[PDB]
Design a binder for this molecule. Structure first.
Ligand SMILES: O=C(O)c1cccc2c1OCCO2
Ligand SMILES: O=C(O)c1cccc2c1OCCO2
Length: 114
Protein backbone atom coordinates (compact mmCIF):
# COMPACT_ATOMS: atom_id res chain seq x y z
CA UNK A 1 0.00 0.00 0.00
CA UNK A 2 1.07 3.68 0.21
CA UNK A 3 4.76 3.80 1.30
CA UNK A 4 4.71 0.01 1.91
CA UNK A 5 6.45 -2.01 -0.79
CA UNK A 6 7.73 -5.57 -1.18
CA UNK A 7 11.47 -5.72 -1.94
CA UNK A 8 11.97 -4.71 -5.59
CA UNK A 9 12.45 -7.61 -8.02
CA UNK A 10 15.03 -6.76 -10.72
CA UNK A 11 13.15 -6.46 -14.00
CA UNK A 12 15.90 -4.86 -16.10
CA UNK A 13 16.59 -8.08 -18.05
CA UNK A 14 12.95 -9.01 -18.72
CA UNK A 15 12.74 -7.49 -22.21
CA UNK A 16 15.90 -9.25 -23.33
CA UNK A 17 14.88 -12.61 -21.82
CA UNK A 18 11.38 -12.57 -23.35
CA UNK A 19 12.99 -11.90 -26.74
CA UNK A 20 15.19 -14.91 -26.17
CA UNK A 21 12.28 -17.19 -25.25
CA UNK A 22 10.36 -15.90 -28.30
CA UNK A 23 13.33 -16.69 -30.55
CA UNK A 24 13.45 -20.26 -29.25
CA UNK A 25 9.76 -20.59 -30.01
CA UNK A 26 10.15 -19.12 -33.52
CA UNK A 27 12.90 -21.62 -34.32
CA UNK A 28 11.06 -24.69 -32.93
CA UNK A 29 10.17 -27.07 -35.78
CA UNK A 30 6.51 -27.15 -34.71
CA UNK A 31 6.25 -23.32 -34.80
CA UNK A 32 4.95 -23.21 -38.39
CA UNK A 33 1.22 -22.89 -37.66
CA UNK A 34 2.00 -19.90 -35.42
CA UNK A 35 4.67 -17.88 -37.25
CA UNK A 36 2.32 -15.54 -39.13
CA UNK A 37 -1.24 -14.21 -38.72
CA UNK A 38 -3.97 -16.60 -39.82
CA UNK A 39 -5.24 -15.32 -43.17
CA UNK A 40 -8.72 -14.10 -42.33
CA UNK A 41 -9.76 -14.01 -45.98
CA UNK A 42 -8.70 -17.58 -46.84
CA UNK A 43 -9.67 -19.40 -43.64
CA UNK A 44 -13.49 -19.57 -43.36
CA UNK A 45 -14.81 -19.19 -39.84
CA UNK A 46 -11.66 -17.85 -38.20
CA UNK A 47 -12.50 -14.14 -38.13
CA UNK A 48 -15.93 -14.69 -36.55
CA UNK A 49 -14.87 -17.38 -34.07
CA UNK A 50 -11.50 -16.10 -32.86
CA UNK A 51 -12.10 -12.74 -31.19
CA UNK A 52 -8.44 -11.95 -30.56
CA UNK A 53 -6.05 -13.41 -33.12
CA UNK A 54 -2.37 -13.65 -32.15
CA UNK A 55 0.80 -15.13 -33.65
CA UNK A 56 4.56 -15.02 -33.02
CA UNK A 57 5.33 -12.29 -35.59
CA UNK A 58 2.73 -9.97 -34.02
CA UNK A 59 4.18 -10.70 -30.59
CA UNK A 60 7.66 -9.93 -31.94
CA UNK A 61 6.42 -6.58 -33.29
CA UNK A 62 4.70 -5.66 -30.02
CA UNK A 63 7.79 -6.70 -28.01
CA UNK A 64 10.17 -4.71 -30.20
CA UNK A 65 8.10 -1.54 -30.11
CA UNK A 66 7.55 -1.35 -26.34
CA UNK A 67 3.94 -2.51 -26.34
CA UNK A 68 4.23 -4.98 -23.44
CA UNK A 69 3.99 -3.13 -20.09
CA UNK A 70 5.48 -6.14 -18.26
CA UNK A 71 6.36 -9.83 -18.64
CA UNK A 72 2.85 -10.97 -17.58
CA UNK A 73 1.27 -9.23 -20.56
CA UNK A 74 3.88 -10.95 -22.78
CA UNK A 75 2.94 -14.39 -21.40
CA UNK A 76 -0.79 -13.68 -21.91
CA UNK A 77 -0.29 -13.08 -25.65
CA UNK A 78 1.81 -16.24 -25.96
CA UNK A 79 -0.86 -18.27 -24.20
CA UNK A 80 -3.51 -16.61 -26.37
CA UNK A 81 -1.79 -18.15 -29.42
CA UNK A 82 -2.26 -21.64 -27.97
CA UNK A 83 -5.76 -21.02 -26.58
CA UNK A 84 -6.79 -19.82 -30.02
CA UNK A 85 -5.26 -22.97 -31.48
CA UNK A 86 -7.30 -25.26 -29.19
CA UNK A 87 -10.51 -23.38 -29.94
CA UNK A 88 -10.19 -23.86 -33.72
CA UNK A 89 -8.33 -27.18 -34.08
CA UNK A 90 -9.04 -30.80 -33.15
CA UNK A 91 -6.62 -32.16 -30.54
CA UNK A 92 -6.12 -35.05 -32.98
CA UNK A 93 -4.55 -33.09 -35.86
CA UNK A 94 -1.09 -31.86 -36.79
CA UNK A 95 -1.86 -28.24 -35.88
CA UNK A 96 -3.71 -29.33 -32.71
CA UNK A 97 -0.67 -31.38 -31.64
CA UNK A 98 1.69 -28.57 -32.61
CA UNK A 99 -0.17 -26.25 -30.25
CA UNK A 100 -0.05 -28.63 -27.30
CA UNK A 101 3.69 -29.19 -27.88
CA UNK A 102 4.54 -25.46 -28.13
CA UNK A 103 2.52 -24.59 -25.02
CA UNK A 104 4.49 -27.19 -23.01
CA UNK A 105 7.76 -25.95 -24.47
CA UNK A 106 6.87 -22.33 -23.60
CA UNK A 107 5.76 -22.95 -20.05
CA UNK A 108 8.97 -24.83 -19.19
CA UNK A 109 11.14 -22.02 -20.62
CA UNK A 110 8.97 -19.58 -18.68
CA UNK A 111 9.47 -21.33 -15.33
CA UNK A 112 13.18 -21.95 -15.90
CA UNK A 113 13.78 -18.33 -16.86
CA UNK A 114 11.89 -16.39 -14.20
O1 LIG B 1 3.15 -16.29 -15.28
C1 LIG B 1 3.49 -14.98 -15.07
O2 LIG B 1 2.78 -14.11 -15.55
C2 LIG B 1 4.76 -14.58 -14.25
C3 LIG B 1 4.97 -13.28 -13.98
C4 LIG B 1 6.12 -12.89 -13.25
C5 LIG B 1 7.05 -13.86 -12.80
C6 LIG B 1 6.83 -15.18 -13.07
C7 LIG B 1 5.71 -15.57 -13.78
O3 LIG B 1 5.48 -16.94 -14.06
C8 LIG B 1 6.23 -17.81 -13.26
C9 LIG B 1 7.65 -17.35 -13.07
O4 LIG B 1 7.76 -16.07 -12.61
O1 LIG C 1 -10.52 -31.55 -30.01
C1 LIG C 1 -11.20 -32.04 -28.92
O2 LIG C 1 -10.67 -32.90 -28.25
C2 LIG C 1 -12.60 -31.51 -28.50
C3 LIG C 1 -12.72 -30.99 -27.26
C4 LIG C 1 -13.96 -30.49 -26.82
C5 LIG C 1 -15.09 -30.54 -27.67
C6 LIG C 1 -14.97 -31.06 -28.93
C7 LIG C 1 -13.76 -31.56 -29.38
O3 LIG C 1 -13.64 -32.10 -30.69
C8 LIG C 1 -14.85 -32.18 -31.41
C9 LIG C 1 -15.85 -31.11 -31.04
O4 LIG C 1 -16.09 -31.07 -29.70
Amino acid sequence: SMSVKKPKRDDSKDLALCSMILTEMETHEDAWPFLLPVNLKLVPGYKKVIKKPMDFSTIREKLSSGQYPNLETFALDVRLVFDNCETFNEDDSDIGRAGHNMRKYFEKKWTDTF
